[PDB]
Amino acid sequence: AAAEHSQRELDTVTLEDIKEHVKQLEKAVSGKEPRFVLRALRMLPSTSRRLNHYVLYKAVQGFFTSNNATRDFLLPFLEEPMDTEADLQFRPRTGKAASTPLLPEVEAYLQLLVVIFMMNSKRYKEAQKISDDLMQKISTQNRRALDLVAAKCYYYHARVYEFLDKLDVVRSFLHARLRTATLRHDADGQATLLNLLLRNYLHYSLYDQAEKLVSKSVFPEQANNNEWARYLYYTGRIKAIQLEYSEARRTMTNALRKAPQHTAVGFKQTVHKLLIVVELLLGEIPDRLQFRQPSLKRSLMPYFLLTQAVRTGNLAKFNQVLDQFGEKFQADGTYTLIIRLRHNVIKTGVRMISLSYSRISLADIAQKLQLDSPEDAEFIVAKAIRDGVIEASINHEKGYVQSKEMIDIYSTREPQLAFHQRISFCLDIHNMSVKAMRFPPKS
Amino acid sequence: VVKEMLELAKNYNKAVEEEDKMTPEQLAIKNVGKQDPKRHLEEHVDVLMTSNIVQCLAAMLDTVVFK
């Protein structure tokens, strides 16, 4: 079939891509720059697909084939093609190259591709045996570059276990395997492992256990954008549950900003799900441009009816939505947070009153927030004032909630401080740009 | 100076946003007249930023030393 003929052409091109990866993989090993591998690993997701049984076999029959037990491990785990007419022997290793054991980078990369194919073939156990052996191979392997290729495999290995749906067997493994990186000052591997570990933690709701891990651990600042985006969501999820709302918004909005423009329709879907609920509990009505966007249109529409409820403050409407769309929230892992809101709808209206009125008499606050009595609002009016949702002072001598007299900020020191955080980053960007500058060793 | 640097950014946008690739290495050598790209660029940034930093630091030192 011409589809497979293009497939083998895709195979050879993927082999050429792999050969490009392996040649670059073998490039970095002798190129003295782990950066090269990152390019091959970013093509990994792209080359992750577009492969069937003939691909790996010819790759493993093209790569490796040193008569090493490696062939004996993944060849049986993947269906072998017949005596195909186009037997393009794709051996980047010729003789001595075959005789030389495959570098830990390419072998895992090829094995990961098998692992990926194992995932692509749903063979998480053969991959399990493949992968842990991969790890059992790379567990001993202590190179500096393999840490990268190991990091990708880890999430896939976490992902193979991810489809295995245990996540506790790897809870310890990923928990210890992490410590191997940190004792190596390795950058990427520590980043990737932590995100997979945390996902493990939230998946069973051990927020207490998770909240600790972020407390002591330090996420490498010079981390992959992809990872930095992930860690920010998980921390945002933890912070939101821990009742540290204000920080939950700052990280989640920052986590969202780091999403890979338009590749991950999902991640943006879930984060917006928490951001909208996270924002509501803090007293801020979320952005409307969200709910109209294409990808998040139907996904967040369930939350849409909510945010309309809070602004309306019609508790009967709010309960009605939880009754209907509430059950769906649980799967999203948000029902609990919404339950907080049901007894927190009064805050925003307290903010709306403080944002527009500046000296509203308490009795008036009760009228405009549906509070039962003028006395009841006082605790709520102060509480919102107490909790820093307002900036007002309740003069109980005559029952009026005065708002703070706003000042000319430009004559105070706020603008200078805002410029400092800005200039420090701007200067740092110059140093980071200049600092690397990667002048290749003049050829 | 900020006004003069602004006009120099306009060219910087035009000079870069052009990014014409008809032998760009030759483009970078057929348009050398001590012009927009950098020489009249941050060259002013150093002057502008040196003048302010020194002035500001003098301002704060005096605020401390003299009462």
Partner: peptide, 30 residues
């Protein structure tokens, strides 16, 4: 701050121009 930003965008532009320079020469070597 405006001085700082200009010096930063110029810095990044100079790394992108340089990243292209060594990469392009990298491929062109083959």
């Amino acid at each position: 701050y405006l001085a700082s930003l200009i010096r930063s965008v110029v810095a990044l532009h100079n790394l992108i121009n340089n990243k292209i320079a060594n990469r392009d020469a990298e491929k062109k070597e083959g």
